[PDB]
């Protein structure tokens, strides 16, 4: 389950980034 | 490099995205996936996640511009500390076993449905001494090429 896991965290990330720049308008 | 083996199982993963066979993933099929992973990105959202990756800026993700991404995300488990923290996650009880139960809690998190059959199918891959958990050196051995 090595690449299985590391593509799910990568879409997690992906969400999170695009979370992340949304963020960073509300703070600035 | 990658092991021809890694990159058959890349090949793999890129297929599960690339749900049509034309050799890209578009916002659609990124779509279709986060949403089956329990996400709901809008269209500008999925276009800014393709756009990071799309090299040629044709608006798709490619088999060569998948591998890259997936090639550098590899680079979040490769140290001996990196793989003890995914240890860590996998083992929610700390008793150095990953059993069904707990495999199956991380790919649930992660937003994956699995079957029971497929979280034991994933076990049997990575139980070397035949006791139906992964320990540490198991998942050490899974971890690395
Ligand atoms: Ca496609
Ligand atoms: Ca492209
Ligand atoms: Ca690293
Ligand atoms: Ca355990
Ligand atoms: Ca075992």
Same mark, same amino acid.
């Given at each position: 389950?090595?690449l299985?896991?590391?593509?799910?965290?990568?879409?997690?990330?992906?969400?999170?980034?695009?979370?992340?720049?949304?963020?960073?308008?509300?703070?600035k | 490099?990658?092991?021809?083996?890694?990159?058959?199982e890349?090949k793999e993963?890129?297929?599960?995205?690339?749900?049509?066979?034309?050799?890209?993933?578009?916002?659609?099929?990124?779509?279709?996936?986060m949403?089956?992973?329990?996400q709901?990105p809008?269209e500008?959202?999925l276009?800014?996640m393709?756009?990071?990756?799309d090299?040629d800026?044709?608006?798709?993700?490619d088999?060569?511009?998948?591998?890259?991404?997936?090639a550098?995300?590899?680079k979040?488990?490769?140290?001996? =500390? $990196?793989?003890? /923290?995914?240890? @860590?996650?996998? &083992?929610? !009880? *700390?008793n +150095?076993?990953?059993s069904?139960? #707990?495999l199956?809690?991380?790919?649930?998190?992660?937003?994956?449905?699995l079957t029971? =059959? $497929?979280?034991? /199918?994933?076990? @049997?891959e990575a &139980?070397? !001494? *035949?006791? +139906?958990?992964?320990?540490?050196? #198991?998942?050490?051995?899974?971890?690395?090429?």
């Open positions: 389950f090595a299985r896991y590391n593509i799910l965290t990568l879409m997690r990330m992906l969400s999170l980034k695009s979370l992340k720049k949304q963020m960073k308008k509300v703070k | 490099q990658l092991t021809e083996e890694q990159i058959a890349f993963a890129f297929s599960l995205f690339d749900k049509d066979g034309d050799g890209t993933i578009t916002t659609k099929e990124l779509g279709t996936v949403r089956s992973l329990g709901n809008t500008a959202e276009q800014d393709i756009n990071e990756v090299a800026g044709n608006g798709t993700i088999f060569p511009e998948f591998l890259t991404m997936m550098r995300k590899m979040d488990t490769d140290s001996e =500390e $990196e793989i003890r /923290e995914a240890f @860590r996650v996998f &083992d929610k !009880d *700390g +150095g076993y990953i069904a139960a #707990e199956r809690h991380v790919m649930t998190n992660l937003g994956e449905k029971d =059959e $497929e979280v034991d /199918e994933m076990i @049997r &139980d070397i !001494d *035949g006791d +139906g958990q992964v320990n540490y050196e #198991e998942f050490v051995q899974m971890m690395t090429a």
